[PDB]
Design a protein around this ligand. Structure first.
Ligand SMILES: C[C@]12CC[C@@H]3c4ccc(O)cc4CC[C@H]3[C@@H]1CC[C@@H]2O
Ligand SMILES: C[C@]12CC[C@@H]3c4ccc(O)cc4CC[C@H]3[C@@H]1CC[C@@H]2O
Lengths: 232, 9, 243, 9
């Protein structure tokens, strides 16, 4: 089976760092936010990012080995978790702020601009503080994003596990090479995986938020964004 | 509707 | 600080096995028509009772009581359903295709169709159950998981005083301690170092799925509460209002 | 308006 199962931890990391999508800039500059202008800004950015995301998924070892149907199902199920972790990751060096784009750094308050938005902002920020605190590494980050893509919809399914194990192997390798003890390795591996179920949770609230914003007719009906939204 | 299966194509 | 941080893996396991809540029996009437309103009353009645025992169990999980009353409330409001669910999947392990809500209440996928949007959730629960069976999850492992849920679920959703920082700090120390315990169980079982990491990962990954099932279940419960098919159980309603 | 803290307190 899969060629991904015969990569060395270092090859694996290399593949993942390679597949990284570009960091998009917001295609408008706020400069007073408004519920409709804010949702159009964030939503505009997300829609674009989804195109690059699809390209990225095709480069994660073992992903393309799945059927078109399973591939579709995996992305529909994790697109937001993936947008979110990408967000928290680049927001690491910006205490109390969310760096949606190099040219769009918002903070908790501007989150008040939209209904039921601040809570989600706070959760994201908490995740970002946690990663900062843990001194998450880029090599670790791309392993986490891949575990999310592959692990999110697998039991909502009704090879993947082999690839997940491989990725766990890689994370331990990174941790070992960094000098952590066997105990510190397991603990950190657990701490990172645990943060994942929180990102899952933020994703669920996010879906509900995005869906309500649609009802309120505040969000521009982007084709791909909506399809992903309806998937659930 | 369907856009995803095509992009992955 | 906390006495929980000076327990040995074996004392830790002992503590949790000791804290285990009693397995309740459903208190219903079998001679009543299966209907959206009767089913919801059955599951919802059971859940409400289990929450009282759940609160007792939490007080016995090492490190829990060291938290402020406010943090204790938060954690439980944020994990009560994941906990009811993991408990469900656990005692449903030895019952392929069925969910053992109670020793006298074993339902299957099809009796789930009895309620709107319920079957999907049943399938997820059953899927999880199958996964645990497949993995041959142990009771010692099970209690370590349930505790990780109680402590990990709402920690990234606290607030922001100096006090809260010490709290989150404390929680993470207990979580690490519990990870130590899982590995210890796995090593003693004879798994290699690699098998240990992989399993630890597999189990923790299942937790995010349980979190997901929890979110759907909340939405479902809340909707059923709009249709007016949920009895006014004081505790359950409170825990459901948390979100 | 307070069931959980009672049982906890
Ligand atoms: C989906 C939402 C708009 C798009 C936001 C976004 C957009 C781009 C991105 O890279 C990350 C995130 C995280 C939070 C998302 C929001 C959660 C609520 C809102 O509806
Ligand atoms: C909350 C629900 C009723 C109570 C159910 C229960 C009740 C007791 C228990 O030990 C586990 C579960 C799992 C699924 C729960 C259901 C999910 C949807 C439904 O509204």
């Amino acid at each position: 089976n899969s060629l991904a199962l015969s990569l060395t931890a270092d090859q694996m990391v290399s593949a993942l760092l390679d597949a990284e999508p570009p960091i998009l800039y917001s295609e408008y500059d706020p400069t007073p936010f408004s519920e409709a202008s804010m949702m159009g800004l964030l939503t505009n950015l997300a829609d674009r990012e989804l195109v690059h995301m699809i390209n990225w998924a095709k480069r994660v070892p073992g992903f393309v080995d799945l059927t078109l149907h399973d591939q579709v199902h995996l992305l529909e199920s994790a697109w937001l978790e993936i947008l979110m972790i990408g967000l928290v990751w680049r927001s690491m060096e910006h205490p109390g702020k969310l760096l949606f784009a190099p040219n769009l750094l918002l903070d908790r308050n501007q989150g008040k601009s939209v209904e039921g938005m601040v809570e989600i902002f706070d959760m994201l920020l908490a995740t970002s503080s946690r990663f900062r605190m843990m001194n998450l590494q880029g090599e670790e980050f791309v392993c986490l994003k891949s575990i999310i893509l592959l692990n999110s919809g697998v039991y909502t399914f009704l090879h993947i596990h082999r690839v997940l194990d491989k990725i766990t192997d890689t994370l331990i390798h990174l941790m070992a090479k960094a000098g952590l003890t066997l105990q510190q390795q397991h603990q950190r591996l657990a701490q990172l995986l645990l943060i994942l179920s929180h990102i899952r949770h933020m994703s669920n609230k996010g879906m509900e938020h995005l869906y309500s914003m649609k009802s309120k007719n505040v969000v521009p009906l982007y084709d791909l964004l909506l399809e992903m939204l309806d998937a659930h | 509707k369907x856009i995803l299966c095509r992009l992955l194509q």
